[PDB]
Amino acid sequence: LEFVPNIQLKEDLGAFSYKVQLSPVEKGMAHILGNSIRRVLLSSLSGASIIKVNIANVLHEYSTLEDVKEDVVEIVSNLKKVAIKLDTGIDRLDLELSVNKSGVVSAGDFKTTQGVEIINKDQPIATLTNQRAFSLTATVSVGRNVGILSAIPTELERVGDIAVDADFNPIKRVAFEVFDNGDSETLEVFVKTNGTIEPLAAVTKALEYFCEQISVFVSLRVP
């Protein structure tokens, strides 16, 4: 009378879709692990994103550069949809971008400094109708979502600074299903992310958080 699960990355597919699995379970506890995984995976996982940007010859968001089919606010909206991957202990740094081309400024043209990563290499940032200079920065920061209310407005210092709101959590869909195997079951969790993390690491992290939160009820003491 002893069952304990191990985790397996079976059935990859699609853009960034996966189907992680935990093979043996306790015949009844499956539907607990499923719900806990889902909810904690949808609310607390932290990533990194752009939060503040400064363009070269601009003063505010409702403006317009020359020879650019785009606008400033359209550009700021483009920037929000970039998928950035940061390493273990960076937690804040700066990105740079300076170009003198005459086409479409994709996000691949960010400076390939250390630590950073730019997964969404196809995403346009701006379209230059004619050849010209173009430059900016963007402070990338770790973070997690907290709700539209308890968010600090991210103080600005320089003149051209322009706050950019940031959606951190890299998870887009979760769904589980539980299968019976006879005195035992197997859990089959779907995950889909932006590609900024690996699935196995993700689910392991979520269960770590969850058990960390449970570990008070083993004591019935304060902390």
Binding site: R38, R39, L42, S43, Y62, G147, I148
Partner: protein, 52 residues
Amino acid sequence: KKKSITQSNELSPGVLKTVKVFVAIKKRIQPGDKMAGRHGNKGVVSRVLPVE
């Protein structure tokens, strides 16, 4: 651009100087605003629930 009255208006005599200021602000929807589909149904946004 200079065929004005040297101050851009007749100034409605008695007025020395005036200035116009233009301020812009984004606004997001919040508990209390009023939505309505095209079919005559309407209501007031009552809460905002977390994704999960």
